[PDB]
């Protein structure tokens, strides 16, 4: 289910982040950090104001 579960940026780590405010779950944590500034969601291209773990903190 890699379309559903693999990070859409590297395709090498599982998705692990929720992007706010757009709400999309598309990226692992390393790819988020690596995103060029200003950081935008790979899915919808909205600015990412905050990252929270998909695994509930």
Which stretches of the chain bind Zn ion, using CB under 5 A? 7, 9-10, 13, 22, 24, 28, 31, 41, 43-44
Cα–Cα distance, 17 to 48 (Å, whole number): 11
13/51 with CB nearer Zn ion: 13
CB of 50 to Zn ion, least distance (A): 12
Determine the Cα–Cα distance for residues 31 and 48; give it in Å rounded to an integer: 13
Beta bridge partners of residue 17, listed in sequence order: 53
- Report the SS3 class of residue 20: strand
- Whose Cβ is closer to Zn ion: residue 43's or residue 51's? 43
CB closer to Zn ion, 10 vs 57: 10
């Amino acid at each position: 289910g890699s379309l559903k579960s693999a990070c859409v940026v590297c395709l090498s780590s599982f998705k692990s982040c929720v992007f706010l405010e757009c709400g999309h779950v598309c990226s692992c944590t390393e790819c988020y950090r690596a995103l060029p500034e200003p950081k935008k969601c790979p899915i919808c291209r909205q600015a990412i104001t905050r990252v929270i773990p998909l695994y509930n903190s």
